[PDB]
C-alpha cells in the first residue's frame, strides 16, 4: 500500500444568532492531527501538539500576521456571511412527502419518506386518527444527499384497523403551513 | 464547537501521493465550489452562487504554501505517514423508487483517509460512465473525508447496480448493491 503524507488547512467560521457571535478557527492539520490553531477568541496561534510549536511561535512573532488573523473574523467570516444571507441562507426547497406500507403477512409498517428538502431543520410527526403517535416511530438520521438537499425516513410500526387514517405531518422553514399526507387502512391487518 | 452555522472558507488539501491538492469552500457541510487547480477555474456547485467571484489564483497560492509546509512536517515527524482508515459505503436513492420514473442512485463513501479513492458504478458487471458525477472530498471534524457519487437512471425490474469502492484501507474492492 502506497504511503501518503497529508496536509490540511481549514479556515472555519462559526455563527450563532445571526452574527451576534462569530468565531474564526484556523486549523492546520498533519494527516489527521491538528497541530496549530488560530482561534479568534484567543487572538494568537496555539500549538495543539509539539509538531505545531515552531509554526505557532514563528507566526506569533510576526506582528503583520497576527493583525491579519485577528481581523480575519470580520474580513472573512462576517463578509462572507452577508453573501450567505442572500444565497445559501435563503435556499428553501420544499420536502416531497410520500407514504408507503412495508413489513418486517399483512402490512405492519408505514414509511414516511421526506425527500429533497433544504435546509436541514425539519419536524416529522406520525398521527393515527388525529392523535400523535410516539411509540413505534423509528427514524433514519438526517441523510445528506450532497447536492444541497436532505432526506429522512420516519417509520411507524402499526396494526391497522379498517378506517384508520395515518397522517405523516411535516414542518419545515420552506412551508407556510405543514404538509400532511394520509394513508387510510382499507382492511384490518 | 456548537453553532447555528459552520463554514470552511476554505478546505485546503495537499497530499504527497499525487502529488495532488484540493480547494473548496463549504457551508453547513455542503460544497459551495471547488477550484480546478489544473485549469485555474472556479467551479460552482450551487447555481445561485454563480453571481459571485472567487479568484482561483488564491487557491493556487494557498496550496503552494501547503506544499511547502508539508515538506517541513514530513521531516519533523520523521516521515510519519497517514494511516489508512476503513471507509464505510452506503448506497441509496434520492427519491422513492418508481419503476420507469427518473431517479438518482447515491453512493456515500464515508470515513475516507487518506483522500484517495476509486468510485465506479457497475450494472450487470459493466462499468457505467454516462450519468455519473461526484462531489469533492468533503471535510469532517475528525479530519477524515467523505465523497458522494451519483448515477442517474430509470429504475427497471431487471436492472441492478453495485457501487464499487477501492481504497487502501480495504482488503478487497467493496461492492455495495442496490436493487429495485
Amino acid at each position: 500500500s502506497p504511503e501518503d503524507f497529508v496536509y490540511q488547512f481549514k479556515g472555519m467560521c462559526y455563527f450563532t444568532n445571526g452574527t451576534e457571535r462569530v468565531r474564526l478557527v484556523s486549523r492546520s492539520i498533519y494527516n489527521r492531527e491538528e497541530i496549530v490553531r488560530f482561534d479568534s477568541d484567543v487572538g494568537e496561534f496555539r500549538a495543539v501538539t509539539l509538531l505545531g510549536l515552531p509554526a505557532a511561535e514563528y507566526w506569533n512573532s510576526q506582528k503583520d500576521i497576527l493583525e491579519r488573523k485577528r481581523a480575519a473574523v470580520d474580513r472573512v467570516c462576517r463578509h462572507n456571511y452577508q453573501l450567505e444571507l442572500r444565497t445559501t441562507l435563503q435556499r428553501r426547497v420544499e420536502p416531497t412527502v410520500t407514504i408507503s406500507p412495508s413489513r418486517t403477512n399483512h402490512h405492519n409498517l408505514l414509511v414516511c419518506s421526506v425527500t429533497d428538502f433544504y435546509p436541514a431543520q425539519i419536524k416529522v410527526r406520525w398521527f393515527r386518527n388525529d392523535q400523535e403517535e410516539t411509540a413505534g416511530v423509528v427514524s433514519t438520521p438526517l441523510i445528506r444527499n450532497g447536492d444541497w438537499t436532505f432526506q429522512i425516513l420516519v417509520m411507524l410500526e402499526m396494526t391497522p384497523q379498517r378506517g384508520d387514517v395515518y397522517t405523516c405531518h411535516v414542518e419545515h422553514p420552506s412551508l407556510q403551513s405543514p404538509i400532511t399526507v394520509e394513508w387510510r387502512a382499507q382492511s384490518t391487518s | 464547537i456548537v453553532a447555528d452555522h459552520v463554514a470552511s472558507y476554505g478546505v485546503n488539501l495537499y497530499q504527497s501521493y499525487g502529488p495532488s491538492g484540493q480547494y473548496t469552500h463549504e457551508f453547513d457541510g455542503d460544497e459551495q465550489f471547488y477550484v480546478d487547480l489544473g485549469r485555474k477555474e472556479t467551479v460552482w456547485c450551487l447555481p445561485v452562487l454563480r453571481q459571485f467571484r472567487f479568484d482561483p489564483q488564491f487557491a493556487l497560492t494557498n496550496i503552494a504554501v501547503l506544499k511547502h509546509n508539508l515538506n517541513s512536517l514530513i521531516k519533523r515527524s520523521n516521515s510519519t505517514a497517514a494511516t489508512n482508515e476503513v471507509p464505510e459505503v452506503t448506497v441509496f436513492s434520492k427519491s422513492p423508487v418508481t419503476l420507469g420514473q427518473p431517479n438518482i442512485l447515491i453512493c456515500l463513501v464515508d470515513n475516507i483517509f487518506p483522500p484517495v479513492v476509486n468510485i465506479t458504478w457497475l450494472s450487470n458487471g459493466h462499468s457505467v460512465t454516462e450519468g455519473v458525477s461526484e462531489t469533492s472530498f468533503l471535510s469532517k471534524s475528525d479530519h477524515s473525508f467523505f465523497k458522494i457519487s451519483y448515477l442517474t437512471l430509470l429504475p427497471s425490474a431487471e436492472e441492478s447496480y453495485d457501487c464499487k469502492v477501492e481504497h487502501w484501507g480495504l482488503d478487497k474492492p467493496l461492492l455495495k448493491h442496490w436493487e429495485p
Binding site: 488547512f9 479556515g11 474564526l24 484556523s26 492546520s28 515552531p54 509554526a55 514563528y58 507566526w59 510576526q62 500576521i65 480575519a72 474580513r75 472573512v76 463578509h79 462572507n80 453573501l83 | 472558507y9 476554505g10 485546503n12 469552500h25 459551495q32 459571485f52 467571484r53 472567487f54 479568484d55 488564491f58 497560492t61 494557498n62 504554501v65 501547503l66 511547502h68 509546509n69 517541513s72 512536517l73
Partner: peptide
C-alpha cells in the same frame, strides 16, 4: 467576492 483564509508558510 467570497473572502478566504490564507495559510502561512513555516
Amino acid at each position: 467576492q467570497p473572502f478566504p483564509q490564507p495559510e502561512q508558510p513555516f
